[PDB]
Amino acid sequence: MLKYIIPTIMLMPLTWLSKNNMIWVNSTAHSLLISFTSLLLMNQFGDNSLNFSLLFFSDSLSTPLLILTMWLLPLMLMASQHHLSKENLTRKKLFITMLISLQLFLIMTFTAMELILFYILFEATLVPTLIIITRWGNQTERLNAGLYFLFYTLAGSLPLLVALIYIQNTVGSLNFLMLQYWVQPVHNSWSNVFMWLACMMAFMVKMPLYGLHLWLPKAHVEAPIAGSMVLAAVLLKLGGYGMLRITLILNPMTDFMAYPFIMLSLWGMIMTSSICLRQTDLKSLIAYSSVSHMALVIVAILIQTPWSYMGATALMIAHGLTSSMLFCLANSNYERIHSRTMILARGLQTLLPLMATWWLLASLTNLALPPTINLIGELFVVMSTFSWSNITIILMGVNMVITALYSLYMLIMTQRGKYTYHINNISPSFTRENALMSLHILPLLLLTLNPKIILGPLY
Amino acid sequence: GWVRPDLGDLSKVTKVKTDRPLPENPYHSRARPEPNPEVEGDLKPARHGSRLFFWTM
Ligand SMILES: CCCCCCCCCCCCCCCCCC(=O)OC[C@H](COP(=O)(O)OCCN)OC(=O)CCCCCCCCCCCCCCCCC
Ligand SMILES: CCCCCCCCCCCCCCCCCC(=O)OC[C@H](COP(=O)(O)OCCN)OC(=O)CCCCCCCCCCCCCCCCC
């Protein structure tokens, strides 16, 4: 992984040593080159994972998450450089540095062989994320959002640290390959119940699990646009990636310990989907949409079937591109009208025709139109959950109806009807904005041609 | 015929002939506890390093 870690680190001197007026050009160009080389991680084998060294490895689960991560950095630089245009040079460079450091921690997080190396980098991502939210967020609420983000994550992750060290003392190793062969079944005792919760709650909070999600509508809404993109696209998926890994050592206890969290997710997805119908803040609506989608990933991971694991991997990738696109679309309106209220600016299809096409495509992927990879992931999860219990099709079916309703409600409210008379500063869409949207949707639809590369290790 | 000893004479350490055998265990000591086994041999580098969590050295 050093062929990706070292180039990522070099983005920092590149940013600091660049000419003042070339910081965005230079960092964007070279971050795209790194993203291009990440395609070499697609050398996956049917039986064995691609094991680089004692520290790092990549299998079909981490590889797509790595490619998404490295793809997101140039998109975030494009999304940020407009609203940071009046920031002074040194603070711009520090903003880019936080983004680079977050990428460094993420790519090492997804390839860490040892769960305690995974833990340190998994917590490490908090620091740059907190700084981005609180320093460069726009509203007073960013300070409160940072505290909710920080202490929800740590309340869960500190018990995880105790559990992981306990496992290493008992097994002798936290190396993930070793745990595949030395894993022992978990006896059903009270002490193992709390080991199970310690190993899972930190990941549940990051998903987020319904009930433990209050940090997300604060953090995702108060962050700057780059903060929201990475928060929704990648950082929510650390929880899914962590759960997909750690459930290996929790069988068979997951059979019954899953029930309370499956109920929270199956009912929670309907609750959060309903909330979207009455949200007044466009960014807040998009944030609650993420909670509903990640409820499917939680359920898929907990029922532990080959189909649910393929579906979960696809959804995580599909949601990452879609939710990031929606935040970027919402941000482009915000940079014009300087409000997040959804009813403020209406009929934007009349004033911004091409941008209204991006809204439509973003909405259709969000409601999982076939054959998008959003639908492929959702379908595979619904199939596996039907086998877990036929009755689940009712909750899955209702959620798909509600999801269509709020996805198109967002489209209709903002893009259709009559334009707001007094809003007269809706200038034409910039080339930058149009390129930013198409760099989300084009890869998303291309993956429909070759879905296997985002179906994970069970494929 | 008695001659008074000179200054310093009576404070000399002298040697005495005796048939009483030298006591073997005048303190009546128990047998001493056995020392712990010595650690011996050549010092070799630690196997795979510190072995602390993920560190490879
Ligand atoms: C294992 C599973 C985990 C998953 C479940 C996690 C559940 C969620 C946990 C939430 C933690 C608490 C809430 C954190 C959100 C941020 C708190 C906050 O912002 O409250 C604001 C409140 C107002 O006061 P203040 O902000 O100071 O006024 C302005 C001056 N700055 O500020 C205050 O009044 C002071 C707030 C102090 C609390 C700080 C947070 C500490 C949390 C750990 C509690 C420690 C408990 C130890 C007690 C042991 C003995 C019983
Ligand atoms: C809103 C806050 C958000 C945070 C949420 C935090 C969730 C934490 C949940 C922790 C609960 C963990 C369970 C601890 C109880 C002990 C578990 C246990 O060991 O019981 C074993 C037994 C298994 O039963 P059985 O399947 O029959 O055994 C195998 C034979 N077939 O036990 C069983 O019968 C299995 C059933 C256990 C689950 C009970 C479910 C209760 C009803 C659903 C509640 C949903 C969650 C409610 C959260 C509200 C919080 C205010």
Curated annotation (Swiss-Prot), chain A:
Q: List-wise, which residues carry N-formylmethionine?
A: 1
Q: Does the keyword Hydrolase apply?
A: no
Key word Chaperone present in the record? no
Instruction: Enumerate the Gene Ontology biological process terms.
Output: aerobic respiration; electron transport coupled proton transport; mitochondrial electron transport, NADH to ubiquinone; mitochondrial respiratory chain complex I assembly
User: Where does the UniProt annotation locate this protein?
Assistant: Mitochondrion inner membrane
Tell me which InterPro entries the record gives.
Answer: NADH4_N, NADH_Q_OxRdtase_chainM/4, NADH_UbQ_OxRdtase, ND/Mrp_TM
Going by the UniProt record, its keywords in alphabetical order are:
Electron transport, Formylation, Membrane, Mitochondrion, Mitochondrion inner membrane, NAD, Respiratory chain, Translocase, Transmembrane, Transmembrane helix, Transport, Ubiquinone
The similarity comment for this entry is: Belongs to the complex I subunit 4 family.
Described function: Core subunit of the mitochondrial membrane respiratory chain NADH dehydrogenase (Complex I) which catalyzes electron transfer from NADH through the respiratory chain, using ubiquinone as an electron acceptor. Essential for the catalytic activity and assembly of complex I.
PANTHER family, per database record? NADH-UBIQUINONE OXIDOREDUCTASE CHAIN 4
Report what the protein is called. Answer: NADH-ubiquinone oxidoreductase chain 4
Q: What is the species listed in this Swiss-Prot or TrEMBL entry?
A: Bos taurus
Which gene is this protein's source?
A: MT-ND4
Curated annotation (Swiss-Prot), chain B:
Q: Which residues cross the membrane?
A: none
Query: Where is composition skewed (Basic and acidic residues) in this entry?
Result: 31-44
Q: Where is this region: Disordered?
A: 18-44
Subcellular location as annotated? Mitochondrion inner membrane; Mitochondrion intermembrane space; Mitochondrion
Q: What does this protein do?
A: Accessory subunit of the mitochondrial membrane respiratory chain NADH dehydrogenase (Complex I), that is believed not to be involved in catalysis. Complex I functions in the transfer of electrons from NADH to the respiratory chain. The immediate electron acceptor for the enzyme is believed to be ubiquinone.
Per the record, the similarity remark reads:
Belongs to the complex I NDUFA8 subunit family.
Domain statement: Contains four C-X9-C motifs that are predicted to form a helix-coil-helix structure, permitting the formation of intramolecular disulfide bonds.
Q: State the oligomer form and interacting partners.
A: Complex I is composed of 45 different subunits.
Under which name does UniProt file this protein?
Answer: NADH dehydrogenase [ubiquinone] 1 alpha subcomplex subunit 8
Organism this protein belongs to: Bos taurus (Bovine)
Please state which portion of the whole protein this structure contains, as first and last residue out of the total length.
116 to 172 of 172
